[PDB]
Amino acid sequence: QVFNDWAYKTMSEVLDQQVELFNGATRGAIILRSAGNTGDLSEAAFWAKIQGLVRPRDPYSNADVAAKDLRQLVDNTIKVASGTPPINIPPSMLRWIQKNPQEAGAVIGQQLAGDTMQDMLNNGLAAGKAAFTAGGAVHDISAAGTGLMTQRAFNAAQRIFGDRSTDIQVWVSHSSPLFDLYDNALANAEQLYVFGTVNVRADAFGRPIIITDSPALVSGAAETLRHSTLGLTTGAILIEQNQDFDSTVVDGTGKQNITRQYQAEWSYNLGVNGYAYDIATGGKAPNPTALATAANWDKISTSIKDTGGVVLVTK
């Protein structure tokens, strides 16, 4: 259907970040289902857990009688709108060394598939980090030793997640923490490694480490450079498209050239397990900074164990 397919010379640099981090690649921790929905929200209501459902009793004394009521909680799923800047397709001028410039549509399409994948992944990761920070589930390791431990850092995160630590089965992280892990694995101060097993991507508990260089997991520079790795439960982060991709090509002939312009719109829903987006505090159409800003995400589930995710911060 594409007018021109991509040839060997048209090896446009696709991307520099791995963006295959959905379902099976991430053991279902970050899902990318497809379901169109109207409005700027998609909220669902479930019954809350009664606090004093079971109470001590004194049969001998009638005394008073307590009163209890049952409430309803509200899950939420914000809709994030994205788009493509107007793209100036060259007007048959890039020809002296290039074979032809008319394949701009195809190169834009391919790079745009790659970049929308990376954009969805980055927004999901930033929203997850912000929500987990809002939930009080952040562990900071910046003052202890070098800044990262081999596995003693992961054990702190599972300690925070608690008695239900077993259901965390995925770690996503930047590549720098992984390389520090390899460095400390290849330099075993506690002799629990042999050369055959120094390349393990697990965390001594069966949880694999998935590596991506999303900028949502790295901030600052030099001494202020902190890498944020966040452990995910099953289906912690939900990203749903609305299958409403739009495009147009307009020839603005008057403005000194026909000036083939390419536009695109697409929107996707994003929602973190156990958390809700504070639309009143945030906005109807949040930007990546609005998603990444704490206090725009409100914890819904009463127990931290039900909320899916924990953030580990290392320098």
Partner: protein, 450 residues
């Protein structure tokens, strides 16, 4: 790229440009005029940047004409191969379901074979993936969908140990919106065992499945992958160049030549007066910025005035360049256009018929072999009779059989020289009978009217 399932082989990247250009040529003039910048360069880049220059280029392409001999050529070759119907050898009732609906859409195996022939004639590549759902399905895979393969020598034998082909589908939601769900299929062969894993995309997703080994009727898995890649050259994983590249290039050259010729025809095809030797005093006083040219009134001109109707003449050098382009297309082609001016000796073409139909026979034989192998694989799914043959029409230059031909085939059948089924196949081929030989037999067994 990298280790993704959707990694595309470097040679597919070799051939994508030519495949796309051939697809544009087959599609018609809409794709060509929409993607004209690929073929016809701007007559001036400095003006190409200029708005007036790009407007001139738009008018230049608009006035052009696309001859469209490529699509007509491929259609003619298709009609030559697919005259009457292919012959299927073996039990018809045991393979009736495969014949009637090859892939569950009511699409006969003959029409899918026609699609295979079209893609092998145009792009010189294709595919026939046979899978098990109970009933076997013989899928059709486009040339640009086979995006990865491997070739290894195991026990001194050539074998394909990997073959990845992309796959598209339509999603069923409650609404009426049309999506495009992409599926990846990975066929592998480890230790002489056929394996098959499905990769699904939902918004750029990967639904990974378990490694499963489809089994035959008795079991025992498979020795080789149930996939065949057919082309114009041979049924090989190696890439076969399309048989239509030269004709497409010639049509592109003809298209740009016709663009130039049409520009000339529009600009300077109208005769013009060019009233030489006029003083503006004369023009203002008597002409008044207007000339009546009809036969009723005569225009007076001063002394030493030479009016000369001026226009470009015929038999131009651009026009005859286009003419030799058309001649080279006809000469470098097979059954593409007809010329009523030309006369050809009968019987003389009998010797060149062998070379003229070369790609026709090659494609017919390759598609017949591919479909025979796929049918055998489906038989191993169903445990049916192995010796089954799918033979396409290798008898080109199909025409109505003459009375002498029919008499000769009848005389040959009357002796133990032609099998009765062969004679009936002849006489249906010549368009003298349409009932199945079985029905004709049961009808003609009874006594004659008299």
């Amino acid at each position: 790229d990298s280790n993704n399932i959707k990694y595309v082989r470097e040679d597919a990247k070799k051939m994508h440009k030519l495949w796309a250009h051939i697809r544009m040529a087959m599609e018609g003039s809409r794709a060509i005029k929409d993607n004209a910048k690929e073929f016809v360069p701007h007559p001036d880049n400095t003006k190409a940047t200029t708005p007036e220059g790009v407007a001139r280029y738009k008018a230049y392409i608009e006035r052009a004409v696309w001859y469209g001999a490529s699509a007509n050529t491929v259609d003619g070759m298709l009609g030559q191969i697919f005259a009457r119907d292919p012959v299927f050898t073996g039990p018809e009732d045991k393979f009736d379901m495969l014949i009637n609906d090859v892939d569950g859409s009511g699409l006969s195996i003959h029409q899918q074979a026609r699609d295979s022939a079209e893609d092998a004639l145009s792009l010189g590549r294709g595919g026939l993936f046979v899978d098990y759902s109970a009933r076997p399905y013989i899928k059709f895979i486009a040339a640009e969908d086979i995006l990865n393969w491997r070739e290894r020598w195991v026990n001194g034998a050539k074998r394909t140990t990997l073959l990845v082909f992309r796959e598209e589908s339509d999603a069923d939601d409650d609404g009426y919106q049309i999506y495009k769900e992409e599926v990846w299929r990975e066929l592998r062969l480890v230790d002489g065992t056929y394996w098959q894993r499905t990769w699904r995309e939902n918004d750029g997703q990967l639904y990974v499945d378990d490694w499963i080994s489809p089994t035959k009727a008795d079991g025992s898995q498979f020795d080789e992958i149930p996939f065949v890649i057919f082309g114009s050259k041979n049924n090989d994983p190696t890439i076969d160049m399309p048989p239509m590249r030269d004709l497409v290039e010639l049509n592109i050259a003809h298209f740009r030549n016709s663009a130039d010729y049409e520009e000339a025809c529009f600009i300077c095809g109208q005769p013009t007066l060019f009233l030489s030797g006029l003083t503006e005093h004369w023009v203002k006083n008597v002409l008044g910025g207007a000339v009546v040219i009809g036969s009723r009134d005569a225009v007076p001109l001063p002394v030493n005035a030479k009016p000369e109707l001026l226009q470009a003449e015929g038999n131009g050098m651009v026009k005859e360049a286009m003419d030799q382009k058309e001649r080279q297309m006809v000469a470098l082609g097979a059954k593409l256009i007809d010329s009523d001016k030309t006369q050809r000796t009968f019987g003389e073409a009998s010797m060149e018929a062998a070379a003229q139909n070369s790609v026709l026979s090659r494609v017919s034989k390759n598609v017949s072999d591919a479909y025979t192998k796929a049918l055998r694989w489906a038989a191993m799914f169903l445990g049916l009779d192995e010796k089954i043959e799918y033979e396409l029409n290798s008898d080109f230059d199909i025409n109505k059989m003459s009375p002498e031909e029919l008499a000769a085939v009848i005389s040959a059948w009357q002796s133990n020289a032609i099998s009765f089924t062969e004679m009936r196949w002849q006489i249906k081929k010549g368009g003298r009978a349409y009932l199945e030989d079985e029905d004709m037999r049961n009808e003609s067994e009874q006594d004659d009217p008299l």
